[PDB]
Amino acid sequence: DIIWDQLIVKRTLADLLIPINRQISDIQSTLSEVTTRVHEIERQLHEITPVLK
């Protein structure tokens, strides 16, 4: 019927979109982690420029 056609169409799209969505979410989390590490480095560099003079 129409309700099973939707499920087959949906699963056919998912064969391609699930991996793109997975790749994007893993990039987003790694990029958020890197931004946090870079923020902490800027905080550390700020605390050690007083010792220069």
Q: Phi/psi of residue 52, each to 5°?
A: -65, -40
Minimal distance in Å, beta carbon 26 to a copy of itself? Answer: 9
Identify the sign of the CA torsion 9, 12, 18, 20: negative
Give, as ranges, the residues between 14 and 53 that touch a copy of itself (CB under 8 A). 14-17, 20-21, 23-24, 27-28, 30-31, 34-35, 37-38, 41-42, 44-45, 48-49, 51-52
Phi, psi of 46 (to 5 degrees): -70, -40
Contacts with a copy of itself by CB under 8 A lie at: 2, 5-6, 8-10, 12-17, 20-21, 23-24, 27-28, 30-31, 34-35, 37-38, 41-42, 44-45, 48-49, 51-52
